[PDB]
Amino acid sequence: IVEGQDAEVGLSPWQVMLFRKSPQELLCGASLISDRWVLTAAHCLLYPPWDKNFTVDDLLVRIGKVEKISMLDKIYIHPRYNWKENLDRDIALLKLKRPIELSDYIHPVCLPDKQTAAKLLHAGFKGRVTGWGNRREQPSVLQVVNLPLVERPVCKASTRIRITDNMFCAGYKPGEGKRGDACEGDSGGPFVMKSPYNNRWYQMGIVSWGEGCDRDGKYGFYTHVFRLKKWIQKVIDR
């Protein structure tokens, strides 16, 4: 996170870190959505231009900073994930080897329904991005930044990448008075918003892509969680 601040203890108990198993290195952020399911970006697992195709034997997740380390049973990547062109449908689900124990530092975030998404997804409304990634383009504390949702035509005019309805963008405009963005290591992490209707946090987006971190006139792009909920529902079953 660029231009953020230290998060208070227990601020994001759904925070998950995706780690390379060997050699061990932080790869991506992720989010806890149940005691057994973890949400992240597809490009964190599969990205052929960088020769990246991680399996369950290549990865570990870290949750709760009290801390929990777990293997993955299965990886689910959206079948229409489009890495060649624009990272359309940049979403993947990680099934944990076994269900984890919940605590003060480990707690799942909510997924939004139609009504929640209609209420919260308006240009100007701020969401929250958290992660352990770079401060500049190695924090010892989870970092947090709050960022405003941006008008879709402003998002499209900021980049040459074709923007689909499965993406939104967020971040300050040049001269808006503030800065901030996800950066290397935060990708796959959650963009959350607090609902006034029921006092709960919902994950609205997944850090997907940007063109540099915290650049004037550029915005972060996030996988639109509600619009991919049909696929989320299908794989999780229950």
Binding site: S103, D104, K126, V144, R200
Partner: peptide
């Protein structure tokens, strides 16, 4: 999960975090 989105160290203890108001401020313009 019935208890999703409610953090034990905040909402469950009726303590709001330090930058929550920034989000609620953005809701009313």
């Amino acid at each position: 999960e019935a208890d999703c989105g409610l953090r034990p160290l905040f909402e469950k203890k009726q303590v709001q975090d330090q930058t929550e108001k920034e989000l609620f401020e953005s809701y009313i313009e």
